[PDB]
Ligand binder design. Structure first.
Ligand SMILES: *C/C=C(C)/C=C/C=C(C)/C=C/C1=C(C)CCCC1(C)C
Ligand SMILES: *C/C=C(C)/C=C/C=C(C)/C=C/C1=C(C)CCCC1(C)C
Ligand SMILES: *C/C=C(C)/C=C/C=C(C)/C=C/C1=C(C)CCCC1(C)C
Ligand SMILES: CCCCCCCC/C=C\CCCCCCCC(=O)O
Ligand SMILES: CCCCCCCC/C=C\CCCCCCCC(=O)O
Ligand SMILES: CCCCCCCC/C=C\CCCCCCCC(=O)O
Ligand SMILES: CCCCCCCC/C=C\CCCCCCCC(=O)O
Ligand SMILES: CCCCCCCC/C=C\CCCCCCCC(=O)O
Ligand SMILES: CCCCCCCC/C=C\CCCCCCCC(=O)O
Ligand SMILES: CCCCCCCC/C=C\CCCCCCCC(=O)O
Ligand SMILES: CCCCCCCC/C=C\CCCCCCCC(=O)O
Ligand SMILES: CCCCCCCC/C=C\CCCCCCCC(=O)O
Ligand SMILES: CCCCCCCC/C=C\CCCCCCCC(=O)O
Ligand SMILES: CCCCCCCC/C=C\CCCCCCCC(=O)O
Ligand SMILES: CCCCCCCC/C=C\CCCCCCCC(=O)O
Ligand SMILES: CCCCCCCC/C=C\CCCCCCCC(=O)O
Ligand SMILES: CCCCCCCC/C=C\CCCCCCCC(=O)O
Ligand SMILES: CCCCCCCC/C=C\CCCCCCCC(=O)O
Ligand SMILES: CCCCCCCC/C=C\CCCCCCCC(=O)O
Ligand SMILES: CCCCCCCC/C=C\CCCCCCCC(=O)O
Ligand SMILES: CCCCCCCC/C=C\CCCCCCCC(=O)O
Ligand SMILES: CCCCCCCC/C=C\CCCCCCCC(=O)O
Ligand SMILES: CCCCCCCC/C=C\CCCCCCCC(=O)O
Ligand SMILES: CCCCCCCC/C=C\CCCCCCCC(=O)O
Ligand SMILES: CCCCCCCC/C=C\CCCCCCCC(=O)O
Ligand SMILES: CCCCCCCC/C=C\CCCCCCCC(=O)O
Ligand SMILES: CCCCCCCC/C=C\CCCCCCCC(=O)O
Ligand SMILES: CCCCCCCC/C=C\CCCCCCCC(=O)O
Ligand SMILES: CCCCCCCC/C=C\CCCCCCCC(=O)O
Ligand SMILES: CCCCCCCC/C=C\CCCCCCCC(=O)O
Ligand SMILES: CCCCCCCC/C=C\CCCCCCCC(=O)O
Ligand SMILES: [Cl-]
Ligand SMILES: [Cl-]
Ligand SMILES: [Cl-]
Ligand SMILES: [Cl-]
Ligand SMILES: [Cl-]
Ligand SMILES: [Cl-]
Lengths: 219, 219, 219
């Protein structure tokens, strides 16, 4: 059921926050503190999202089906910080950071329009949103990776792992979307929630740990 | 269905035992043999639990719902050995081992009372059981980790990984419990079984492999 | 539902192909190119299988139930290449390769007979197919591992990980089979599809990445 996964999401994000929080406090140096604090806020942001959705907020019937528009409101806040874990670890220049944040903001807004518009029109917006996402794939796969590998020549494998896991996790969101009642409707509303919840826990708590392990590798 | 996951649990634990068994035999030295044998017994204990539950044993209708009280009977036997993988790898002193086993035994007995008592009374016992679990979180996170890191100074990352994975896996059990009909009832009896089965395979077969990889790291 | 997982399978294998394809192109040397190309074809083969099954092809009612015989047609093509990732990485001699491919081909054909025959007769074929699989377990666990470890003495852990993950993943297929309506019928046709799809994505996309990480370890 929808409620079950929304409550699993609340506790998992809340417990993720406690761990990153206890890590933020008791951090060795400033570099460790910033990384734990970024991840603490990401999980606090997702905890709030799931708490509102679990309590039945941020949902309205759009085009016949119940739609959690609040997901886009918070993804607009957490995804930029999730991209900052990468640029912070990589020590990426401000212009590339701006490009990434720019493309990320374009993808979510057009992605939001695809969710609230009736079909076939929504497919146009889904396509626009995917092109913005493919602009991010390129930025991380090419200029981000190159700059990060030239800055950390003994740790090329750490950035390949960061980027690849990021690519695998972020690609499943438009897939879930196109297979849900928003697209082809191959599965219900209940499966869509389970999928987004598993994806969110993985992209926030999971990537959270991966970014800390990456910093231990970099030393 | 309940039966499906109970039979997946039997085979997974049985197959886990065969692998640790074949490892116990053909072990290089005594240190490797003890680790494979600990894990062999853990999985043999879980195989028996799932075989009894799959055959419909160790279940009675308590407070209107069917309750697998046999889970606590075997968790009382396997969880102490799962804590011994940690103290064995870490080379932890007997007093700390006793403290861990003590808190672990207190958590399961009060945890068992929470399962057999009617609500609201059961919430008191759930809270007592959680405090005992938080005493274990502390012991592993602080004196266990410190002693293990001072004994293995080149392998601090191995113990951070052992402890963190242990913390993530063991925390999901009270979550599953509070969301099941024992607590808030956000999901059925069929989902509770699937969850405990996935958790058990992960905590026994999965942690089993993680503890062997940790020993290879320590050399 | 059956269709949902079949479409998740199509996209996941298609996306796996794009990644290995983009890797095949842009590969440093010949060794990297062969590995990415092997994995590119494996995923292209699975993409085709799922596309046919998703479009309702390669299925007929055998012994009362709908049976996807096309799974065995493609497993006959992809599993030999999945074994070649191992022999290619390990630098295994042609005779052992032939033995592995031989036992693999025997397992699938008898495995195919078990699927199309009525029960109890099908159990005989399931048993024959399992013995052929246990001949593969032995070959990878013993002569393959020994030869690969003597060729790569600083990378014994890489081959233990390749072999173990292969052993864990390939063992779940006969388990899924014996628990489905083909055997004991502990779960429906819809769960069987979900299970094979999760197993296939893991054994092809997942093992795909694991074999690339193994090559980075070997250098
Ligand atoms: C913590 C939340 C995360 C990491 C979610 C990120 C969401 C996306 C990458 C979604 C992208 C979408 C498309 C590429 C096209 C339209 C549909 C979207 C919005 C799901
Ligand atoms: C192999 C089995 C394992 C690792 C299970 C461990 C079980 C727990 C850590 C359960 C703890 C519980 C609470 C902290 C409060 C009450 C409910 C329990 C018993 C599920
Ligand atoms: C990419 C597809 C993969 C890796 C599938 C491999 C399938 C097997 C190892 C199945 C083996 C079977 C038995 C050992 C006995 C009869 C049933 C089978 C065919 C499922
Ligand atoms: C809902 C949960 C929100 C989590 C809030 C705070 C996490 C705790 C931060 C840790 C500070 C404790 C100080 C310490 O002991 O190091
Ligand atoms: C109606 C029953 C609602 C249950 C009440 C409270 C659950 C809230 C606990 C979750 C922790 C807060 C997470 C956060 O926003 O940081
Ligand atoms: C109903 C109000 C919905 C409007 C808020 C959604 C904005 C989300 C976004 O900008 O991505
Ligand atoms: C919450 C949403 C905030 C989003 C982005 C934070 C903006 C900070 C990014 C600027 C780069 C950091 C820097 O100044 O070096
Ligand atoms: C949104 C505004 C940010 C635009 C600035 C982007 C700088 C691009 C240069 C680069 O990609 O390195
Ligand atoms: C630097 C990038 C900042 C992101 C800004 C992106 C703006 C995208 C432009 C147009 C999207 C369409 C505006 C939304 C109208 C939706 C109407 C509706 O709610 O039905
Ligand atoms: C019964 C309805 C029929 C269902 C047909 C579903 C067809 C699925 C095919 C293609 C999915 C669209 C491709 C996904 C976009 C790739 C994500 C990205 O842009 O990175
Ligand atoms: C230190 C490196 C370790 C990182 C390796 C782990 C990589 C695993 C990545 C992705 C697989 C996880 C996918 C599970 C998320 C749920 C997806 C869904 O339900 O749609
Ligand atoms: C080393 C520290 C990492 C260890 C454990 C944390 C693993 C992250 C858990 C999130 C998994 C997401 C999911 O549910 O699939
Ligand atoms: C139910 C399954 C129970 C498993 C029982 C025993 C595992 C086999 C132990 C391995 C001993 C074989 C000797 C060897 O070849 O090394
Ligand atoms: C009624 C049908 C019951 C099926 C019969 C036997 C299944 C037992 C096989 C499981 C291996 C034993 C596990 C163990 O206890 O070590
Ligand atoms: C019915 C008999 C149940 C009594 C056995 C349960 C004991 C479990 C425990 O001590 O943790
Ligand atoms: C089965 C339940 C047995 C539980 C615990 C085993 C007791 C052994 C613990 C003592 C520490 C080991 C030692 O003597 O060094
Ligand atoms: C149960 C009995 C065990 C009590 C002994 C605990 C010793 C505590 C000292 C320590 O934590 O290091
Ligand atoms: C060293 C720690 C050993 C663990 C001993 C813990 C004992 C806990 C004390 C009291 C728990 C309550 C006793 C169980 C009564 C349950 C009655 C019932 O079954 O309904
Ligand atoms: C060892 C003491 C644990 C036993 C707790 C009593 C509850 C089990 C029972 O009902 O018999
Ligand atoms: C429809 C019924 C409403 C459901 C409300 C569910 C509320 C869930 C909120 C909190 C869960 C309890 C917190 C879990 C305990 C933390 C585990 C631990 O002690 O380590
Ligand atoms: C060598 C280090 C490798 C260890 C890293 C792996 C860490 C992954 C840990 C936890 C995620 C797995 C959670 C899946 C268990 C099922 C949970 C459930 O269904 O409730
Ligand atoms: C290196 C050896 C470890 C490799 C494979 C074993 C992985 C453990 C499998 C248990 C997974 C638990 C689960 O079902 O989530
Ligand atoms: C269905 C998807 C099939 C995938 C087909 C081809 C994958 C793309 C191969 C990459 C070649 C592009 C050249 C390059 O930019 O390196
Ligand atoms: C009826 C609707 C069918 C949907 C149509 C086309 C989906 C095909 C897209 C999948 C990519 C091809 C995979 C491959 O074979 O390489
Ligand atoms: C109906 C035709 C089925 C025959 C094709 C299946 C062959 C599979 C195999 O050889 O393993
Ligand atoms: C598609 C099915 C093809 C199956 C196997 C490919 C045959 C090549 C195996 C021979 C070993 C490679 C070599 O010649 O060195
Ligand atoms: C099928 C034919 C392949 C038979 C050849 C097998 C060679 C066996 C020698 C070996 O295992 O090293
Ligand atoms: C080198 C190994 C090559 C693999 C060849 C294996 C051949 C196995 C032998 C006999 C299997 C039975 C033949 C299939 C008859 C099925 C009849 C039917 O479809 O109902
Ligand atoms: C209601 C019907 C009863 C269901 C009983 C199911 C019994 C399950 C017992 C054993 C499963 C068969 C063993 C699996 C084969 C091992 C795989 C291998 O050969 O490697
Ligand atoms: C670089 C080494 C990393 C490899 C370690 C990961 C090992 C995990 C292996 C197996 C667990 C995954 C099982 C999930 C597949 C789905 C199974 C099913 O649904 O039947
Ligand atoms: C280092 C590169 C590997 C990182 C991510 C790829 C993980 C493989 C994803 C397949 C997971 C299979 C599954 O769904 O369980
Ligand atoms: Cl969020
Ligand atoms: Cl470096
Ligand atoms: Cl147990
Ligand atoms: Cl050390
Ligand atoms: Cl295939
Ligand atoms: Cl080597």
């Amino acid at each position: 059921m929808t409620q079950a996964w929304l409550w699993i999401g609340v506790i998992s994000m809340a417990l993720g926050s406690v761990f990153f929080g206890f890590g933020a406090h008791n951090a060795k140096n400033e570099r460790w503190q910033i990384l734990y604090t970024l991840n603490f806020f990401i999980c606090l942001i997702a905890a709030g999202l799931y708490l509102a959705m679990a309590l039945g907020l941020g949902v309205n019937v759009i085009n016949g089906r119940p739609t959690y528009w609040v997901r886009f409101v918070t993804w607009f806040c957490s995804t930029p910080l999730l991209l900052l874990d990468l640029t912070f670890l990589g020590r990426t220049s401000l212009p590339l950071t701006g490009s990434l944040l720019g493309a990320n903001a374009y993808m979510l807004v057009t992605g939001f329009v695809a969710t609230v518009t009736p079909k076939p029109m929504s497919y146009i917006w889904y396509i626009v949103s995917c092109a913005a996402y493919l602009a991010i794939v390129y930025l991380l796969a090419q200029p981000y990776r190159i700059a990060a590998e030239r800055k950390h020549p003994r740790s090329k494998q750490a950035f390949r792992t960061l980027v690849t896991v990021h690519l695998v996790l972020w690609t499943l969101y438009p897939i879930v979307w196109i297979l849900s009642p928003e697209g082809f409707s191959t599965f219900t509303q209940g499966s869509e929630t389970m999928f987004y919840t598993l994806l969110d826990i993985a992209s926030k708590v999971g990537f959270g740990f991966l970014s800390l392990n990456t910093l231990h590798t970099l030393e």
